[PDB]
Amino acid sequence: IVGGYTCGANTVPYQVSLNSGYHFCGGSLINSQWVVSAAHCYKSGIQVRLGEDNINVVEGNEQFISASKSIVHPSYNSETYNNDIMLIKLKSAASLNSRVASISLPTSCASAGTQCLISGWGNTKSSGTSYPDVLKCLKAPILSDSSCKSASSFIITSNMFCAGYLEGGKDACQGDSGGPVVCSGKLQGIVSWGSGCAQKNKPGVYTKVCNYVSWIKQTIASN
Numbered sequence: 001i002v003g004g005y006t007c008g009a010n011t012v013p014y015q016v017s018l019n020s021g022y023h024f025c026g027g028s029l030i031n032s033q034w035v036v037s038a039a040h041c042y043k044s045g046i047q048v049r050l051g052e053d054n055i056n057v058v059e060g061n062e063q064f065i066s067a068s069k070s071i072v073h074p075s076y077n078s079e080t081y082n083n084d085i086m087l088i089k090l091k092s093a094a095s096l097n098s099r100v101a102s103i104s105l106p107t108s109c110a111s112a113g114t115q116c117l118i119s120g121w122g123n124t125k126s127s128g129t130s131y132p133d134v135l136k137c138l139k140a141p142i143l144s145d146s147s148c149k150s151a152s153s154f155i156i157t158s159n160m161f162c163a164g165y166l167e168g169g170k171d172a173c174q175g176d177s178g179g180p181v182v183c184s185g186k187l188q189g190i191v192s193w194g195s196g197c198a199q200k201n202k203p204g205v206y207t208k209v210c211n212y213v214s215w216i217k218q219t220i221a222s223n
């Protein structure tokens with residue numbers, strides 16, 4: 001997260017850290033047994049870390065649970081990143097409490113202008129490298145497709161939306177991938193891709209979750 005602020009320990013209880021010996025992607029807890037992340041975060045041997053703030057220090061509220069199954073969207077396209085969404089099932093149900101909770105799925109899509117909260121342990125520099133140990137937060141509005149496309153020249157699909165600031169300075173970044181984009185109390189997006197970080201006219205691109213609710217529900221019910 002570039003240009004954000006420190007969230008505060010466990011103030012974003014649905015945020016998870018995917019770990020393979022180190023943090024490599026974010027994710028969101030949708031119920032006691034499932035996590036949603038980005039398909040481009042796919043990897044074998046994943047451990048899901050819940051209730052985390054500082055990812056380098058055991059503070060007491062963490063829950064470390066291995067993934068039993070990973071399901072990448074059947075139509076994920078690694079060339080365009082269309083359908084960049086993946087589901088992960090935990091080997092054992094997580095214990096839900098005030099510091100570890102699920103985030104609700106959308107009943108309807110969000111509209112341009114809506115304010116959202118993006119969070120992650122990704123790079124905090126637009127130029128250079130600096131990874132934080134504590135969770136970072138950023139409030140960003142969803143941009144109209146027209147404003148996003150005309151300014152960035154990005155190839156976007158109906159399964160994506162941009163959010164951020166065209167003037168640059170505030171944006172998600174590498175390391176934030178798979179993380180949540182919550183607006184009006186619902187999970188409306190997943191950190192998917194972008195060009196560099198916080199660059200002018202290059203806003204972040206996010207997977208449009210409201211388009212996958214049916215798939216998510218059916219998948220978790222059958223697995």
Ligand SMILES: N=C(N)c1ccc(C[C@H]2CCCC[C@H](Cc3ccc(C(=N)N)cc3)C2=O)cc1
Pocket residue numbers: 040079080081171172173174175176177191192193194195196197198203204205
């Ligand atoms: N044409 C495409 N769809 C496309 C273009 C570039 C990349 C590379 C890469 C680089 C590899 C790691 C994944 C990644 C992560 C990332 C996430 C958010 C942001 C941001 N909001 N500024 C930037 C980068 C990304 O977009 C992937 C896909």
Ligand SMILES: [Ca+2]
Pocket residue numbers: 052053054055056057058059062
């Ligand atoms: Ca910790």
